[PDB]
Amino acid sequence: GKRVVVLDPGHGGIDTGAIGRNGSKEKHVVLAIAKNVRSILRNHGIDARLTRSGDTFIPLYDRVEIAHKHGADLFMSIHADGFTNPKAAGASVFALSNRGASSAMAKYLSERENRADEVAGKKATDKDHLLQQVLFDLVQTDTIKNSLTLGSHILKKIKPVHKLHSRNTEQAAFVVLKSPSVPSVLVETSFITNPEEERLLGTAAFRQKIATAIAEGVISYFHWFDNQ
Ligand SMILES: [Zn+2]
């Protein structure tokens, strides 16, 4: 009865994700961080798997399908996305809300992240949107509660290491958080659009520090869960 954790490095292939002022691509940065997290979790006896181990495009639903196929106890998307103002900064963790965004920045990023599927030509029909809302509405309460707890465990560990954009786990209607049963969060490691954070994201030490904080968060979460 080993724990399975599925890590989704956001973007990939033709989807660069956000690009920093000095040209860094989210997709490369988050693959590096995701791999680091995997290693640490496996060193501690958790069966951690990637939705992609190379530079590949994956549709948002397929990322969640991979979590389901592997029987995940936990699913985590890792990003480093953008805002239109270079001054937005700090790390975030998000869980689902089907009712409405908890913050303006949650609402902004859920839209930006959810439109990643468009890079492949596939603009979302109304019928697609209806199916999303229905599916978000079906997510269990315990799932969302557990994702919020996971989220506060991760923020607790990031906080001593790097600026938080928000002290709480925020919520919005992220497609990759649509699993009814698997606790799911999306982690923003920084804003790549902030020049200082782009620079940090460009360093092995920072990527390692951030990945360490994320893995400690997961581990801390499993500890809490087992004590209940
Ligand atoms: Zn992203």
Residue numbers in the entry: 55 to 282
From the paper:
Peptidoglycan amidases are key hydrolytic enzymes that are needed to break the peptidoglycan layer during cell division to allow for separation of daughter cells. All the three division-associated amidases have overlapping enzymatic functions in hydrolyzing the peptidoglycan amide bond between the sugar and the first amino acid of the peptide cross-link. In their resting states, zinc-dependent peptidoglycan amidases such as AmiB and AmiC adopt autoinhibited conformations in which their active sites are blocked by an alpha helix containing a conserved glutamate residue which binds to the active-site zinc. The activators share a common motif, the LytM domain, which forms the proposed site of amidase binding and activation.
